[PDB]
Design a protein around this ligand. Structure first.
Ligand SMILES: Cc1cc2cc(C(=O)O)c(Cl)cc2[nH]1
Ligand SMILES: Cc1cc2cc(C(=O)O)c(Cl)cc2[nH]1
Ligand SMILES: Cc1cc2cc(C(=O)O)c(Cl)cc2[nH]1
Lengths: 412, 412
């Protein structure tokens, strides 16, 4: 009844690479992108490391002058978006531009821009605030600037669901296409919260790993010595496309997006319920949306943020949804390597789930030296595992109990 | 198949009142809610007035202790949301809680809280950043906190499309219900951008009226002496409900939501095109979505922000869409009275459009003393106009060239 939705283009900035192939090579190699932060004085901070984008040149995408108008999170979102559109080979024309939209989100948006303009405001007064402060800092300006640059006149919006943003953005973009509002959507997320406010904010909540002595070992999902998440920056974008449209132009199809689930925990502002009941409802919703039996799932890209409560809740949710099959599927947290890109986490992890299908390899959970009590599933400890993957699930859970699941399948 | 969506509950904080009835009374009376700002010293600012929420008591909704953790935009969004849910008479149960979701958005979210924590960080150090900085400031936490307080386990997300947020939030929530992801959604927007960075930021862009001597006269959509928008605070929430679900429980139905349009201008970061081409595309999309002859439109709640370029572009768009019928419909800007609530604008204006249907009256455009060149439509200058309204359209246009239109009609 609804139209089928396929992935024809992907783009990324991550702590592992300035594009998808370099990032994916890092993932399959078990490489960490976590390092002491260099771009700011963290002397007063209990966490002094994170996943930075290393060597990003915005001038490959924008003039210096246009880039100066935009927070880093918008620059990162545009870079991933331009990559994804180029990767798709899509030609935007007068005939189709009304059928091509964009939904690129962020969890936290323009903290670095706000910090910089704050400094000017407090030291000199409001006369020193940039004229571009508002349009250069608001979360919908990845969608806005991408649409202006490429001439996209389809649905133009942005989601902000904290750490679930990238997953929800991709899922709702798939709905736009499936139910006929667009033929193509650029969807995903971007984040740059490695500023005083980001590290300070999460630090004040005591939510961050403080393993400053061994940053590459800090992100250790399901390991008994985990002590909170690692803050990371970057972006992921997918070109989502109606199947008939993709086939008509001879698009290379990476995978099909067959399922999208949402749920609210309705439990706590930041903490998940012990049994992951909302995450379980969300995964079941995604599987029902895809018309799939739980036993058809081969690979789960976990939320797996390396928090004591979250990692255990996620094991409980998977055990509830999949029963005995929980022991047959493979589940890994690529955040073991990338850290937590917050709003961009679901976008880069959708891409890793699609590449898991393409290459038939489950990425590793690195740092899983001593699995905690009840963490007895195949969590792909230490090393990439070649295996059969017909169906891959990507999970994101966020503040406010907001849950999202995407289900991808090999394209037949 | 596409299910019908009705409005069964509404809630509001505005510069005209602390609920819908008091706000609507102010609208039909031609009252201004614009006044010199009292909550901060604006002596260094070019604009020193706006639409404040006057006498808001968060303790009518939340404990003092919980409220201290939450930016005003979250307090305002929860107040509107609790009002809307109470107004709907809906009882949340184990049987329906997975089918009730929330999409309450904001254009900039917790700017006041971020500014205050900025000041703590720069003046005193990161040890003075609030532990509640992130959950108290990020845009998705209206949806989060509402779901926690009421036990809502359905789709839980937030849109952020600058000044189009409230319109998009309602439209996409309607799609969730229409296509079966939920039976009920609480949808709308909230904004509190009246801090140094908000007033300073819009001020630096020269986007604000500087009529400090006569604040109640500053917002004058389509008047030749207009000189930019008036910044306003508050919130709107609607309970959207599947028609058969509403009928089954004997719900009071205000109106049906029959049409939703989106488009991108793909033109400029902040400015609309002179001919309002994107706004015209958006309205035509919404009218086709509603299965309507454009001649069925009786009343348009305009974007009408009181900017020289914006107001004219909107006249051009309406003339392009409606042709001769442009002279039969009534169009007014309630922003003449409320100012521009930014992300909440579309939410409060959806409510005013629904009440225009209920009471068969077009709200006035106050301050329209001397209509500009080509502003020769029925703009309901000065005084409310009783008239036949079967179909009401609400328009929102925003930064990034984002456009949204909602189409409401009387329900028997
Ligand atoms: C289940 C479902 C269908 C759907 C359609 C649209 C649309 O664009 O028409 C949107 Cl936004 C969200 C949706 N969610
Ligand atoms: C099942 C589940 C795990 C989890 C972890 C986090 C986190 O702290 O990263 C959050 Cl927000 C929600 C979660 N829900
Ligand atoms: C047709 C149209 C009028 C308009 C006004 C504004 C504004 O500046 O308030 C914006 Cl962002 C977009 C607009 N699009």
């Amino acid at each position: 009844s609804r139209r089928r939705v396929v992935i024809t283009g992907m783009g990324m900035l991550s702590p592992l690479g300035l594009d998808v192939p370099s990032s994916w090579e890092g993932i399959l190699a078990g490489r960490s992108g976590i390092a002491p932060i260099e771009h700011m004085d963290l002397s007063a901070y209990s966490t002094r490391f994170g996943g930075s984008v290393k060597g990003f040149n915005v001038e490959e995408y924008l003039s210096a002058k246009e880039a100066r108008k935009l927070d880093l999170f918008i620059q990162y979102g545009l870079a991933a978006s331009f990559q994804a559109v180029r990767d798709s080979g899509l030609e935007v024309t007068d005939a189709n531009r009304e059928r091509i939209g964009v939904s690129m989100g962020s969890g936290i948006g323009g903290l670095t821009n706000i910090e910089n303009n704050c400094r000017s405001l407090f030291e000199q007064g409001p006369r020193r605030i940039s004229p571009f402060f508002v349009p250069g800092s608001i979360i919908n300006m990845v969608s806005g600037f991408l649409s202006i640059h490429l001439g996209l006149q389809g649905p133009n919006y942005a989601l902000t669901t904290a750490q679930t943003t990238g997953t929800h953005s991709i899922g709702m973009a798939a709905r736009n296409i499936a139910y006929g509002e667009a033929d193509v959507m650029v969807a995903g997320g971007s984040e740059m919260a490695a500023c005083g406010l980001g590290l300070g904010g999460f630090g004040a909540a005591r939510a961050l790993s403080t393993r400053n002595d061994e940053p590459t070992r800090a992100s250790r999902p399901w390991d008994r010595d985990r002590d909170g998440f690692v803050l990371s920056d970057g972006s992921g974008a997918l070109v989502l496309e109606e199947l008939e449209h993709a086939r008509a132009r001879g698009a290379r199809i990476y995978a099909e997006l067959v399922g999208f689930g949402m749920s609210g925990d309705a439990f706590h502002m930041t903490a998940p319920p012990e049994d992951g009941a909302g995450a379980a409802r969300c995964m079941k919703n995604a599987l029902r949306d895809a018309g799939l039996d739980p036993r058809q799932v081969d690979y789960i890209n976990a939320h797996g943020t390396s928090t004591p409560a979250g990692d255990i809740a996620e094991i409980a949710a998977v055990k509830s949804v999949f029963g005995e099959h929980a022991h047959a599927l493979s589940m890994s947290s690529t955040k073991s390597m990338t850290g937590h890109l917050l709003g961009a986490a679901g976008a880069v992890e959708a891409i890793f789930s699609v590449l898991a299908l393409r290459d038939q390899v489950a990425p590793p959970t690195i740092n899983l030296d001593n699995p905690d009590e009840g963490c007895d599933l195949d969590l792909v400890a230490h090393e990439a595992k070649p295996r059969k993957i017909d169906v891959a699930l990507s999970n994101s859970f966020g503040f406010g109990g907001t849950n999202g699941t995407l289900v991808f399948r090999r394209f037949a």
